[model samples]
Target: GPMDTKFKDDLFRKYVQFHESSDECLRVAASTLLSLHKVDPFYRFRLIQFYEVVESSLRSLSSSSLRALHGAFSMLETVGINLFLYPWKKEFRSIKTYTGPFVYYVKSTLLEEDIRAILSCMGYTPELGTAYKLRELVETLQVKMVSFELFLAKVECEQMLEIHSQVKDKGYSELDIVSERKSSAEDVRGCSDALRRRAEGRE
Candidate 1:
């Protein structure tokens, strides 16, 4: 029980820190939901869960907390970022394209298919006139997007190292060839000798 209490206490501290951080974090989290409509239109149901969480938390907060919530939303609006861009418009085509590939990559590499399969369980039809409901959905999807971005960063880092290995194997000797072109004849001769030595047992 003591350990559980400590764990909860630590969690509360982190949660408070999250709330207190620059409005930018809140804005980014909130904006994530807005991007989701184009990012994964099929999983709009999951967005509802996010909105409920934010709305419920906001209801419990004081006036000061509500002010912060408004601040986050205001910032998002000023930046012209809406979570759900309907009709899958051509202007937002870049967002739509990237999101599909990103989701597929995440599903293939990081998340289980079970997570994806759960999307089908949402059981709600789209209501175009229900734009107000998007606030909550955006909030919820933002949290999910943040976690997915972290996974993508890890995958990208691994890919970078793989490319670096390929570049290295192509050889530092290639650099010497370019250097020879820029150097004196003596230096070029010296580099050729060094290459020969390396190829032989001289090194």
Candidate 2:
């Protein structure tokens, strides 16, 4: 949706401003976002630290909707990987037979053109050995999703979709609680209990 994209654009711009300005002491400052935007998406794992920093900055804002939007954005970012990569996983899996170093194997396996197309959907510039780096990102995200019990085994597209939905719903729930009344003990207990249950169920 354009509206969701609008929110992302604004938030990302705000993040970049907060990062770049010296006067901002709280969220801190950097030109990192601009440089990152220019980075090849296959190397997007480089953005992971930035994502955490950006989310923390979002949380620091006073608006409930803005805070909730972090969760929404987080979920969206996770899904975006699947939207582009899952189609290539079979090609990815078959190439596992290579006995060389994993990174080199991946680097050798993919065509330059394929990487460019995929990275175009994902990010910028034709760079060498990007397919390998992109795989690093998928493995990291897969680890995160598994941590949430979002996957047991096999490639289940629905599971990724389900996780995103839950994350978005959780964000909206936070919005509801914040708007329903002033912050209170009940809200804390409910959120805490949910977190506990989520933790308990996973491991």
Candidate 3:
């Protein structure tokens, strides 16, 4: 058996954003979760489950934010760029509006890029750069999110030898667990403790 502590650890700190109100990353996550329905039923049902809460949350304020902002900041966190220079509210609205169609496009419920091109031509080009960065972030996060969820599914089924797909994100590798499978409670519980502990540990 192979216990991929690093992979688990990364997920313990993983970048999951699909549940957010207006993030394009939500579309990526929804695609992966929907695909996971083919491999197992948890994600499929969970999507419905999350949607219930998401619908309520969104209706409540159309949502409270941090989740989307968290991912956006995490992605932009890479370098020396001046963070204060950006227009946060306007750009976030743009992200939200576009995500409506983006999710529909992902579901094949609507066509998207042509419309997007039209919008860009209408001269929202600076937004294009921000969107591109966010999209790249989504692509990278999708690989990790899918990997973590699939790996968790294996552990839930107690498939300890299932080799993890290599993380497309850098500085990681193929992973698996040598330890006995923990119950889902044990697995999920750690993540909560970690979240709190991480909070306490943070500057």
Candidate 4:
């Protein structure tokens, strides 16, 4: 359906802004994706869409073309190794747990590139051995992170059961309580607190 005519201009402007912002972010995000790939090649396949987006964005850049190109390469080197090592983390039970580390790895790995890109966009050849070392580090971290995730999940499940029991004693069904209201911030906080307590008890 066609949108309101008056809003079209505003929408287009916003779209352009979003495209530019996404292009910049994607260049950096590609680094994270690459890092995660080392741990699980499967993730690399999963993130193929992002790779396309980054490439497309690079093609669109006019004034900052060289900068964008360099950004893309720098991101590739940083993210490539991180992905290779992602699977070994104990905390990475699901993709959710890997989000922070992925973001952190990209930021940390490309900090120098970020600064340099801001100053000038010049491509530099990446060292093959250094990239290999990064991939190895990513693998080691993945294992540790996965273990942490398993431990966290175990503690959270116990706490959820406890909460349900408390609700049951009050003549309320856990499902009923959850369904009766929107999942507000308060509800999320309560759940998180219960999980934290369970984790503390185990510790």
Candidate 5:
């Protein structure tokens, strides 16, 4: 609504990715299509909607492909093409090998570190026992390939920390902020006794 003419003009010119200079017929046809598409409301709508559907489908396909190089590269190139298309916009600031063609080799399981990292993002470091129980929960499910969507869903429903009574007080805020500072600060002063003992032992 704001700048249809300006943007359509820009897109029309910007869309000329390939130049078939030798074929006069193609050049005229391409030019005619570009000009005709921008001016007609119905044609323009269809063209834009087609692109939107394709782009969204590509995103969904690539993301769901799950840990394949082709999947990763496809998503990357999709983003690359999107960025290329809108060069007028400001530039924004910014895995595993398997053997056999299909040896059923897939990294579909979660690791302890993966859980730790995920919890770490929430600023809640699971205690050793807590981590153990969570892993136990993973095994109990008996699913080989855990999609992230499913894992998160299961985690939310299971309330992974409920097994441990120490975390019963809803101590989600404890680990990252208050406890971390307290632990670090206390350790500095807390070590005084040990420091004194070590010094005395040397003499």
Candidate 6:
């Protein structure tokens, strides 16, 4: 667990570093994550983006997680307006009452602080808000407090987790390949006429 946290800490530092300069060039330099720490840069970027959309607020619940997060908002709405709108749950779905202005109506409502706590527990925070604007409170809470399958949808979560496994998987896989090549694929470096099969790093 500490190993995983260590990787996230390493990436977040890079995110803050380049995030201010607006260079977007840091990923190249940030590739140092790959070469230096041996963690994949682009791989971790998606995870940060996941938190961006999720806790950013009601706007993302519908599309990013699709129907998956429907319950997240629906429960909040029912609780917020249940006394007034209980019967409308069926209406919203069956009569499509939530299709147009209703969408804006529900989204505009304030999310209760308790609801935010639930979302924070769901592995999200508006801290990055796409990284153009970073919120300090959410950042402090989230980077320390959140963990989820990344995207809130089970399928997407499963998929991203599969691809973005761990530095352990990626690191070890690369090691296996590189060592295989270095020892077995031992092609020699160009050293003039003696350009024999190059075992550059291999003794």
TM-score of each: 0.20, 0.20, 0.19, 0.22, 0.16, 0.23
Query: Per-candidate RMSD vs. true structure?
Result: 20.7, 17.5, 18.2, 20.4, 25.2, 16.5
**Comparison by TM-score, 3 against 5, better one:** 3
Clashes by residue pair, model 2: 19-29, 19-30, 20-30
Per-residue accuracy of model 2 over 43-120 as CA lDDT, tens digit each: 222223322322333354434233333343333333333433452455532232123443242223223343233233
lDDT of 6 by residue, 146-203 (tens): 3222211222223222222322232333223222222231111211112121223233
Q: TM-score of model 4 relative to the true fold?
A: 0.22
- Clashing residue pairs found in predicted model 1: 33-138, 34-83, 35-83, 50-140, 51-136
Candidate 4's C-alpha runs over 4 A off are 1-138, 170-203
Number of the candidate with higher TM-score, 1 or 3: 1
- Report the backbone clash tally of model 1: 5
Among all windows of ten consecutive residues in candidate 3, which has the lowest summed lDDT? 76-85
Error of 3 at 172 (Å): 35
> lDDT tens string, model 4, 3-64?
23343334334433443352334323332322222323223222123223333433443332
RMSD of 4: 20.4
lDDT of 5 by residue, 1-203 (tens): 12145644443343333320132333333333323423431232321122222223334433321223223222222323333334233331110113232112111222234333333322223453242112221221112111211222222112211222223333332122222221222222222333334335642
Off by over 4 Å in 2: 1-55, 62-67, 70-74, 77-203
Clashes of 6: 4
lDDT minimum window of 10 residues, candidate 5: 140-149
